[model samples]
Target chain A: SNAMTHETDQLYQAVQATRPLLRNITAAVERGTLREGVTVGQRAILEGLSLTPGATAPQLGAALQMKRQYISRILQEVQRAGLIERRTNPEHARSHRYWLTPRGEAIITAIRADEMAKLALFSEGFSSVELTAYHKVQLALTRFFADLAKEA
Target chain B: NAMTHETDQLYQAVQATRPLLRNITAAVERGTLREGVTVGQRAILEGLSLTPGATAPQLGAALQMKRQYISRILQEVQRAGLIERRTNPEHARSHRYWLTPRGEAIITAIRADEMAKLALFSEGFSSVELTAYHKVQLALTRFFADLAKEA
Candidate 1:
């Protein structure tokens, strides 16, 4: 019971610490994406494409944890922007696979570089050891959330 | 050049950390603040609850929102009958804000919902791990604020 109480207190602190950072990072990322003439949702789809080329809408939806219907709508906007092209999926004839056009690749690359520069500036004082430890905790939290989401 | 590479690694780590945070907060917000109250309004309501009879400027300071933004939310809350404005002796014209009984109940419900969400998310996390994560988050928050200030 004591252990439970201690864990609860720590969790409270963790949540308090995390909420503000989430707000700030979200605002920062949104501002950056807007300056590049893309919504954050569009940028997320681009990022997902870069990581997993030739992914179908359903696959991208699963990987990004977005709804399939929402992904379909965003894919239409992305395709219209000339940033992505859908080709016939060899395995699944019903669905199309998305591939980045040269234009898409260039824009995504520039956006990623800009994001990195901003992160670098924000992470100036953090040490390597601290970052590693932080990453481990984040991985654990991610796994926890994934499990929680599965239950949902 | 080495500094650039190191920064690059740090940047990657930071990006990777963000999505999970976003997902959790999205879930918490959906659960807690979905009842006709915008996030801005919720923040102001929470602030007012703590500092009842606060002027708009005081509430703005507490919530880190602009006075204009706070005023708009305050008006909405007042209109909703969730909050009331009383004459302020401190500043004759700029009235002090207080939560009505209904407003107090709503804000209390919102906070309870938020706490439950956090507790659920933290269920499997151990004390030591949570402590370490909390420390790292505080550091990142400080660094983020510093960078934001610079920008």
Candidate 2:
């Protein structure tokens, strides 16, 4: 296996870059007057809400492979910040669902837009075909790894 | 300008990849026990410690871009976990420095070893240069972004 090869410098660079990516998202979320110290798991919960309206905490937690209790704690913090509102889950009387507040919606929109702009800037050098190729390769690897994770 | 192009599909892939990459690392950190739900910030703090041998509460707060109080909370948690400990500092009577031990040491080793393995697997890629590229991109961007809050 090529795993025997040592690209220690490259690997160090990889670790270094990982932090900024996490931090930038955190900064983006905080820009909305939401609190700092939000976990990636919490951000995933919020992003899941971006796709599915009125996402329940348990639903989001299950999808993200996080604990519902932990998800609820983070949700409560975001809720207390007024970025999200918890309402009764229509399907389940005892359970609750989360919907973004106006602020949450605005923040999600801005975060997505900012990310779009960043990608546009970052890929300026690549042609349309090249970008498509890039996108396809990434998606393939992402799906591959996600499947690998499921099996692992 | 590519801005005039229909980059939404590509951007969607990029967005998808961002969180996918996040999950992969989150999993790696958790599995390796470098950082996770309770102590994700510790890995970075340990990394920063290489620059400064011991970190005080205020130093940790500044490095983590957290409040002094929040830094204290994590320090206490790490302290209890026995992954990190508090040491006496010369200047301040109330202040203590934070340092790591066996569990944290093991995780940092695993983290580096895993990155190397992934880099080897990524060699066939053109975007693979971005294996390092994106990683550094993320780290520098976060460093500046976090520092930006202070500035």
Candidate 3:
């Protein structure tokens, strides 16, 4: 069956495509944070908070696909650095939410802009339709793998 | 630019995809270890070692993607369980390697069977063409992102 050949090719493509996104994101976050005297993880946490104000550690953890314990550790470090503050969560009395401090907010804003600029620079040659097609294919690949895992 | 839309879609896909793989793999490994007396991770380690028996801490770090300290913890756990053993590398006196036993061979066989079953499930797929497409797309994506990394 050309089946094995097809699967091998697809797997290689998917892994190769995804690996760069992961590597670049990791590098970008590290660079942005290091330049600002903040930990990479802390910067990521703060950026997550900016998107979801008063976000709980669990919420941030889910978004980042990180363990809650890991996210909590990063949260504690960032809080200690005065980049973020813990506030009461009206939805849950037992759990507190995180909000970006003034400094944290500024950093997140800058980081967000930086991310957009970087994306623009990298994607300049691709047309809007091409970019859309690329992402659509990616989403399909993601779903395909996820479905395989579930069925397995 | 459809950049914002594309990025948001990709993020959503990741959010949905991660748990599906994580939970299933974790469950399969747990079940195999308990019921079948084998685990998928053990098999992967064995497969990796078929070529070279590398250092326990180094192998653990590579697979788990953890810092050296956390990988050391895993190495300790495997050692205590007797699933792994320390052997010196001839080239590097200070370096060590982990070797799998005959029992580990059984686990590797089971894992291979499971992977083959998965591969066969996509029965109607044009395996060769799909694979080529997947490779090209993956390479392009990686290239774009690496460029961003430099930026």
Candidate 4:
């Protein structure tokens, strides 16, 4: 159990060490969102619509791992922004599909282009090996969270 | 022009990566914040302990948060008596912050609880993998700080 305890401490340290970087990135992205006059939630919804056009609110919520209620509110907000529109889903008459409007598509495209450019810049010094390793860790952590969410 | 293009690309990458980090943090905070202390308050308390007599703007700079956001969390901490605000000798208009004994105890407890939760979640992780993950995170932290400086 002592060895287990030691390993646990090491894991905790590893996790704690990432908090500052996370906070800094969060602040930077918040600044970006503010400049564009969009909430992060709305941005996520827009991105989701771009990826899966005509997705229902429930489908978007599943893809984003958000609740149906929250997704409904975001859909309404994006609709108000004239960025997304709802169309009748042929398969399910009661459910509507969300599609990005021209304005929405234009905005999301610009945002994605900017994001890709920034990612290339930030990844400059990183080696392919390092990038792969980082991605591996992220994948593992994502799986870990998915399992936890299922349990909850 | 090449350098400018690279910088722009890097900025875009940084923006894209933030959401992933935010999601992970939100999930962890949702689990941890149920303990009564918010993630923001906990971070402020820890920062105050480390940098005694630091002003709100100073803490904001260190934490990469806006001064107004820091001030809001500071109010919560002050109300909890976890921190004390005193006049700064260097700047009469600004107040310096220090953690109270109770504040220190609370932060310590919060950290311990967080550690327990992380440990429980990371049980099957290999030591080698953990080390690699830690090293990559530290490198990312350094890179982020450098980018922030340039911006």
Candidate 5:
């Protein structure tokens, strides 16, 4: 006797759709990026460094919605591999921010260029406005779910 | 470059959402503990609610989990009096699983909470944006599925 509205069902199904995309994309990305000598999350953190150079683990974790400890672990792992180097931030230096070393730069930049090449494979005809909206909706839902589970 | 910038953000969201969504599901499952079932048990109970005469392998395949693990979780659910096994006419080696009345009630409660939360999550978005978002995701779901197959 319980009925969910079409609007609600649409939202739920959209979330449902992400499961397969998540699975397949995760698998695909893991396999491809492993060839680049980093795990998926490591590669993501490296890529994140490209976006915001001199970012701390907490800062990157905040942006990625991951825990600070987990991000710190990855940052340490990347640093050990000599891909990233720690830098001082006078504004907030308790936990130092990181930047890609030149060694880090060449590798992540190549990885990203290859990512764009991979993007060229798909011809789904999704427009910029459509994708921007897509990102906003998913980002909103993820944040909302995080909030829901936070207090509940 | 314009197209690259737009496409990149969507891909980034795809990468980022999975882990957080996984955490939320685990959190929800923990919240469901008051219902007298582990998350895996709830899944088996829900599976039988749909296919009342499912064998362990059948349910395991549907759940995309290991049958050995499914059998173990089934035992826990059975002990909790939420599910019971019935003789299978087709295969005497394994029995079919069915949810008891209490099991039915638990699932109803769990799903009701889930639906309410989903409705709240969907609230305040324009129908057009919501619909458009779903359309693009549907496309992405297919694209990734294909990419996975080729790999």
Candidate 6:
């Protein structure tokens, strides 16, 4: 455990509020008018495919930190929804590689671009140093929280 | 919407980090806390320490929490002998609350131990960096909260 200081108290206060903050962000993103019928889970899978085309459910699950069951479920959804197609994997005969359809790519790509633009609007009014320090601290805090849980 | 390199990283960090932060908060509050005292309950004690003889409604408003939940935790603390409430002089059917000595010790010790465990972060950041992180997080929280309203 670390020593308590005014600095730690202030940081911890902000850290505690972030869980709720993140929830609000997720709610906004999910319910926002950016797209219809594409859930956060489905969007994540779509975005994952955009980055690495022709990926298996297991591979994407590992990359996205999702469970096998969840991946299986969303794969069915995206496939049925016509956002993706299952193709035979060359490396493994029984396994399949998932590829995004044109419609899926257009929706996800537009959604991402729109989101990035909106984030920039929300991100104004900070010094480069402040943003730099924020990223550093956020990365550090993520690791710190993990170790805190590990020890607990 | 387009992702600027810097803003994209900020957004990414928040998305990836927030779930971990949530999990750990619940983990500690449930696993490490003594008795029925929750994270928010300790907050109640801390709030009561600042405003003695405050009614449950007043305390809940100050904490920006639900009055019903406030009364519920108030019951938990009262049962644990950490707080006592008497009928409010200002209103009918309202009760005033303040920490018992046991509650004071509980709140004080809780903060000290929580801050002590923050040693992982206490030494790792400069005061300026810590302030910057807090500012960024608060700004993001406010922005997203506002976004939720629009949604």
Best by lDDT: 6
How many collisions per candidate? 0, 7, 7, 12, 0, 8
Off by over 4 Å in 3: A9-24, A58-68, A87-95, A124-151, B10-24, B27-133, B140-151
Per-candidate alpha-carbon RMSD to the true structure: 6.0, 7.8, 5.8, 6.8, 3.9, 4.2
The residue-level lDDT of candidate 4 at B33 comes to 60
Q: Which CAPRI category fits model 2?
A: incorrect
lDDT of each: 0.73, 0.56, 0.58, 0.70, 0.77, 0.78
Q: Of the true interface contacts, what fraction does each candidate have?
A: 0.34, 0.20, 0.18, 0.25, 0.50, 0.61
Model 2, span B1-151: residue lDDT tens = 5473545865555455465676565445444543332334444445445544344545555455555645555565465563354455665554444445644555466656556546644665655444434443453355437534742
C-alpha DockQ of every model: 0.24, 0.17, 0.21, 0.19, 0.50, 0.46
Top TM-score: which candidate number? Answer: 5
Per-residue accuracy of model 4 over B73-102 as CA lDDT, tens digit each = 999989988899897777798889999998
Q: Candidate 6 on A1-152: residue-level lDDT in tens?
A: 33356677787787777667767777777764346568878888998999989998889999888899999998898889899998887778877898999988887887777667767777777876887788888887777767766676
Q: lDDT winner between 1 and 4, please give it.
A: 1
lDDT of 3 by residue, B1-151 (tens): 5567655544454333334345445534643554344343453354345535555455555554445543554354365452454556565554554545644565556555545544653353445434443543554456545655564
Error of 5 at B91 (Å): 2.1
Q: How does model 2 score on DockQ?
A: 0.17
| Model 6, runs deviating above 4 Å | A1-5, A31-33, A51-80, A86-98, B1-3, B23-27, B30-40, B50-72
Per-residue alpha-carbon lDDT of candidate 2 for residues A33-147, written as tens digits (9 for 90 to 100): 2333344455556667877778777788876667778887878877877778888766787778788888777766766665566556555655556556555545655664465
TM-score of chain B of each: 0.79, 0.53, 0.56, 0.71, 0.89, 0.80
Q: Model 3, A86: alpha-carbon shift in Å?
A: 3.8
The DockQ for candidate 1, computed on C-alphas, is: 0.24
TM-score of 4: 0.60
Clashing pairs in 3: A6-B127, A6-B128, A9-B131, A10-B131, A13-B134, A13-B135, A17-B138
